Paper text:
The nuclease-deficient variant, hEXOG–H140A, was refolded and purified similarly to wild type and used for co-crystallization with a 10 bp DNA. Successful crystallization experiments were performed at enzyme concentrations greatly exceeding the Kd value for the weaker DNA-binding site of the hEXOG dimer as determined by ITC; consequently, DNA occupied both active sites. Both DNA duplexes are oriented such that the 5′-P end of the substrate is proximal and the 5′-OH end is distal to the active site. However, the two Wing domains undergo different conformational changes from their positions in the apo structure: one rotates only 3°, whereas the other rotates 35° away from the DNA. Consequently, upon DNA binding, hEXOG becomes asymmetrical where one active site remains in the ‘closed' configuration and the other becomes ‘open'. The dsDNA is bound to each positively charged active site cleft; the substrate strand interacts primarily with the Core domain and the complementary strand with the Wing domain, explaining why the Wing domain of hEXOG increases specificity for dsDNA. In the closed active site, the complementary strand interacts with Wing residues R314, R315, R320, R324 and K327, with R324 forming a bipartite interaction with the +3 nt DNA backbone at distances of 3.1 and 3.4 Å; R315 and K327 are, respectively, 4.3 and 6.7 Å from the +2 nt DNA backbone. In the open active site, the complementary DNA strand lacks several interactions, because the bipartite distances to R324 are increased threefold (to 9.4 and 9.8 Å), and R315 and K327 are similarly displaced (10.2 and 16.4 Å, respectively) from the +2 nt backbone. The nature of Mg2+ was confirmed by Mn2+ substitution and single-wavelength anomalous dispersion data.
Human mitochondrial nuclease EXOG (hEXOG) is important for mtDNA integrity. hEXOG depletion selectively increases lesions in mtDNA, but has no effect on chromosomal DNA. Human EXOG shares sequence homology with members of ββα-Me nuclease family, which contains nonspecific endonucleases. The catalytic Core domain of hEXOG is identical to EndoG, but its C-terminal extension forms a unique Wing domain that converts the enzyme from a nonspecific endonuclease into a DNA-geometry-specific exonuclease. Conversely, in mitochondrial LP-BER, the nuclease reaction occurs before DNA synthesis: hEXOG processes the 5′-end of DNA downstream of the lesion, generating an optimal substrate for DNA synthesis catalysed by Pol γ.
Numbering used by the authors:
A (entry chain A): 60 to 356
B (entry chain B): 60 to 357
The structure:
Amino acid sequence: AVLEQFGFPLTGTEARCYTNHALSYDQAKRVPRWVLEHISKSKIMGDADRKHCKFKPDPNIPPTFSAFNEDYVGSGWSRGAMAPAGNNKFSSKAMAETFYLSNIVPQDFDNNSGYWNRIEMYCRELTERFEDVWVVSGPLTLPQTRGDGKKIVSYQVIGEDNVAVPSHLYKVILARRSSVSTEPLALGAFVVPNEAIGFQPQLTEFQVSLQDLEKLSGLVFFPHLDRTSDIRNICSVDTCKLLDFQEFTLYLSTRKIEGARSVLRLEKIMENLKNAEIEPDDYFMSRYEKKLEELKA
Amino acid sequence: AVLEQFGFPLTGTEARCYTNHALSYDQAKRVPRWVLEHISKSKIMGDADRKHCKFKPDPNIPPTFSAFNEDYVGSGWSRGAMAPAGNNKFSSKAMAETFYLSNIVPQDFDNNSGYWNRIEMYCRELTERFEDVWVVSGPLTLPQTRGDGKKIVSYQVIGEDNVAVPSHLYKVILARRSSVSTEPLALGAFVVPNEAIGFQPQLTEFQVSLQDLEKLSGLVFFPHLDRTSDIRNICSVDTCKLLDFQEFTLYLSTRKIEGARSVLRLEKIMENLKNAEIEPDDYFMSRYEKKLEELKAK
DNA sequence: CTGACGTGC
DNA sequence: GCACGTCAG
DNA sequence: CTGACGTGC
DNA sequence: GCACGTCAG
Ligand SMILES: [Mn+2]
Ligand SMILES: [Mn+2]
């Protein structure tokens, strides 16, 4: 009728498809509401290198509602990708699209480089055991209850564009053994506080029911999912075991080997590795000698 | 590809149409993001009465994401309609739908019955001078700059369902003189804090540019409105003048005549006027003597 | 006009 | 616990 | 792997 | 001020 003569207000929440992920953008907060990615063992292999990528505004987002690097730099918060670059080694285009700020939230540096990175590495590990893995990640601004029962949502906004800093990050993991497998699906929802987290807390300490997360986020995840199909807790069908300090430090050092462009850096890697722990079994020396061998050329 | 194998997440932000308004619901905050209404002379006349209406959850909203009266009662916040009941005198069906909690936000009681009430009455007043008036209303949670330069958004959530309490309320007013007139349209955008305001601040003190409001709300208002055509500031073409204390009080006293159930309550309405040294006009006096004659036969 | 609150089925 | 009469800004 | 930071034109 | 080498979790 005449009510829509000049159109309904636009919220800009429609799904946006990229090479290897999709997202819904929150124009008021300058961050994604959710970012959906599909992981398989083929996608996490390849020569795509993030050194040739740089954060930038998503051109498909109206500049009025876009975040800009000026909002993050100097803010005290790191640019935290929801769809990580590590899941897009198969395509330079796919990886570069993860560096769109439409995929980024203000994230604690330690959290970004530590616990959240470890969760991301677990999702990649799942592809060694499940043919297909679906992951939805996004930010949350949860309330905190005072001693008198009053509940308050408090979160910082940074930059000229007031980019919302989430209090928590969520991750919903859906895994299917194989296309023909009559085995149940594995499902897990996790909510992590946007702060430094050590190596003591297991991932199950941050596990929540999907229903609780849907009430906290206002989102319905995987709506096409058959509610009577056998779905099991991913931490019962699998391990939900993140890497401990020793494995984590070794994996970082191994990745640093493959990128060592000089021999002097190769020595620094070993010095950092060896102190204050770690003798590499089964595997860091085999790749250390190989890179040392080639670099002599 | 297999990316959408089980469907994309659902935000539930699609426009929902009712008899005389439309809204987009915020499932995470349990309040509407925006509520659009169209006002005309005909729509604000009629016999529809609030006494036949009750606040209830919107049946079209998934209960998982719905607010409930239990969230509001005893919270210290009033239920504040975005599309007001006063704009739906023409239809009891349309008025009942404004009491769906999908149209409601937690609102300061004084602001709700005072300053915001007066802005709504100005929107109805505009139909005396414009054939058609469109109004978009909704909540805002704006940041506050702290002493250390940090910018913090901070708002309360109330009830078992964590209904978000907005820090501000916005209203965008679009007015067209006539369907055939070549006169530019009149546009105004306003942001009012969710607190008691009083009669000192003029409405223009709360005016903002449409682009500022869109930047703050993350919404694009009236996307089919030709913004490159000449559009006039409504406070320049019109008055943007809310009722002052005397007019407001006299208008409330007039409405209260109709609802007085006793001769003692009707006379107190006249007493509070004269005790405030407000002079009753003729329509009030005539309406007052009519009701008084009819109440002394109880 | 805008609302909440106490009473009684 | 709602429906409804009462009371306030 | 995840990132920021210091330096140079 | 960005581009890029260097550095840190
Ligand atoms: Mn990250
Ligand atoms: Mn109201």
